[PDB]
């Protein structure tokens, strides 16, 4: 959607992606049409200089599972103009997952999807296991929260 999208400012902004999580991080750039584009991943505890632009939008996920992550305590990161040539830091961290979500992550990392139904757990959880994290669904959710909050 045009709501969540990068603006073609053409105004360079120096940024540093800092992975302060124990996950391999996938930076995702929202292009000019609001479509998510992947960028090189970051290993845990590593940082990297990025040449981005004022008004561009970024979000971050676990590279292998797409589990949600936060950047500077929030969902989206928007580069601003550099002051005194100081790069803008994008500190990526794990959010406090609910205990239920964390257990689902672990079970998913150990079980093949075609085997979920073989687990001796309550019926309702089968659906939860199958409803894995999805960036597209997140963008739609964020857009509703975005609009529907004014």
């Amino acid at each position: 959607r045009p709501v969540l999208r990068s603006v073609n400012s053409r105004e360079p902004s120096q940024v540093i992606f800092c992975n302060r999580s124990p996950r391999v991080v996938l930076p995702v750039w929202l292009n000019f049409d609001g479509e998510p584009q992947p960028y090189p991943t970051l290993p845990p505890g590593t940082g990297r200089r990025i040449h981005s632009y004022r008004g561009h939008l970024w979000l971050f996920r676990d590279a292998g599972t797409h589990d949600g992550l936060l950047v500077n305590q929030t969902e989206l990161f928007v580069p601003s103009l550099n002051v005194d040539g100081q790069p803008i830091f994008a500190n990526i961290t794990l959010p406090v997952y609910t205990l239920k979500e964390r257990c689902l992550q672990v079970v998913r990392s150990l079980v093949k999807p075609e085997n979920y139904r073989r687990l001796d757990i309550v019926r309702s959880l089968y659906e939860d296991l199958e409803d894995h994290p999805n960036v597209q669904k997140d963008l739609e959710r964020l857009t509703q929260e975005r609009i529907a909050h004014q």
């Binding site: 800092c18 302060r20 750039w29 960028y39 290993p43 505890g45 590593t46 940082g47 990297r48 561009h56």
Partner: peptide, 15 residues
């Protein structure tokens, strides 16, 4: 329309 890009540079460990 200019997109983001990564300069050839060595990553650094977060201390």
């Amino acid at each position: 329309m200019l997109a983001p890009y990564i300069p050839m540079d060595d990553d650094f460990q977060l201390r």
